[PDB]
């Protein structure tokens, strides 16, 4: 029950996430593609058999017993994507993700090696500092009484202005610096 | 560091080697033992009666 936009996980998202995790663990269990395809079709049959179940508490009990079934027979070491958390290559390049504001501390001698890039950087900084008050006034007039309810940010609803709090998401370092 | 490196025979640590290089060459030449078990001469020390 930890989501950025919502406060809880519904039944449909629980079933979909259980299906995805079960299929991933089944793919980890059998190495070859044809055996995985056969057993994935079998699991798709098992999930499709109980699709049209209008009894809500029966769906809840089916979810509980399916979760116990998945926990009983999951792989001890499932396959993890290299960029996924817990992978071999996870957060490896965070030692090269230098933040942009370090360029504000560069010497003028080494700032002359890239003139046009720093001119465009000055233009970007001027745009940010001229749109900051407009976007904070947009935020302060749209947030309801008692603070925001969710973490969803409003878009730019006018012409010429930018979406609020756009700097640190647009100017984030790349995945391969 | 140059002054420390060229210290003139610190704590005579070299000298105690060189004198020893003489002294062994004494007592090995005349059949004397290398070192006696008594630091001082036993003839010039008086023990209490027991």
């Amino acid at each position: 029950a930890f989501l950025p936009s919502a406060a809880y996980l519904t039944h449909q998202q629980k079933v979909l996430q259980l299906y995805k995790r079960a299929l991933r663990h089944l793919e980890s269990r059998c190495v070859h593609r044809d055996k995985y395809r056969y057993f994935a079709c079998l699991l798709r049959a098992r999930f499709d058999e109980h699709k049209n179940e209008k009894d809500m508490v029966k769906a809840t009990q089916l979810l509980r017993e399916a979760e116990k079934e998945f926990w009983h027979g999951q792989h001890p070491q499932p396959y993890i994507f290299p960029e996924s958390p817990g992978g071999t290559s996870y957060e490896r390049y965070e030692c090269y993700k230098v933040p942009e504001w370090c360029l504000d501390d560069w010497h003028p001698s080494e700032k002359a090696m890239y003139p046009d890039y720093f001119a465009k950087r000055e233009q970007w900084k001027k745009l940010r500092r001229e749109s900051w008050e407009r976007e904070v006034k947009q935020l302060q007039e749209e947030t309801p009484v008692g603070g925001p309810r969710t973490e969803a940010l409003p878009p730019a609803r006018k012409q010429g202005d930018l979406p609020p709090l756009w700097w640190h998401i647009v100017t984030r370092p790349r995945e391969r610096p | 560091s140059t002054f420390v490196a060229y210290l003139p025979d610190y704590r005579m640590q070299e000298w105690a080697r060189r004198e020893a290089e003489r002294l062994v060459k004494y007592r090995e030449a005349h059949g004397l033992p290398l070192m006696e078990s008594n630091c001082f001469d036993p003839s010039k020390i008086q023990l209490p009666e027991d």
């Binding site: 930890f2 989501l3 950025p4 999951q74 001890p76 958390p85 817990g86 | -």
Partner: protein, 155 residues
């Protein structure tokens, strides 16, 4: 910062409990301080006591290295439950079964090592024969003391 935002004594009245819950930025029903047994904790909340590895890694955390937000109350043992340190992730195998299996494995192989040490293996040969009174002079023996004569015969 100011004086009435720092932690204080253990709350007793429900109004003090509500004020401490508002100070720590969470609900009153979820604000459970440490029991006042005199250990020095005070009004610090008792968080559910799990490591930071159990947090969601795909959420847009304010501190993705530690998987922590801004303004959220920290654990009393947050320096112990970082990802560089002790982890409390749910294991696929129960803890007691793992401990009993490891102890049984180690104890069984130690016992069998002792049993094999009691009954060693070898090859059907006599002792190796060395010349010159089992090499008395070559073993560092003194040349003045004549060794006891050991004679090996042809077979």
């Amino acid at each position: 910062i100011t004086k009435d935002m720092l932690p204080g004594p253990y709350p007793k009245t429900p109004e003090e409990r509500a004020a401490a819950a508002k100070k720590y930025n969470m609900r009153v029903e979820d604000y459970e301080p440490y029991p006042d047994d005199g250990m020095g904790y005070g009004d610090y909340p008792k968080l559910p006591d799990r490591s930071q590895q159990e947090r969601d890694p795909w959420y847009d955390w304010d501190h993705p290295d530690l998987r922590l937000n801004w303004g959220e109350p920290m654990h009393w043992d947050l320096d112990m439950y970082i990802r560089n340190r002790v982890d409390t992730s749910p294991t696929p195998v129960n803890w007691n079964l793992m401990c009993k299996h490891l102890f049984g494995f180690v104890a069984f192989m130690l016992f069998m090592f002792w049993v094999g040490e009691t009954y060693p293996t070898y090859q059907p040969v006599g002792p190796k024969q060395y010349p010159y009174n089992n090499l008395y002079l070559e073993r560092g023996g003194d040349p003045n003391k004549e060794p006891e004569p050991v004679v090996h015969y042809e077979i």
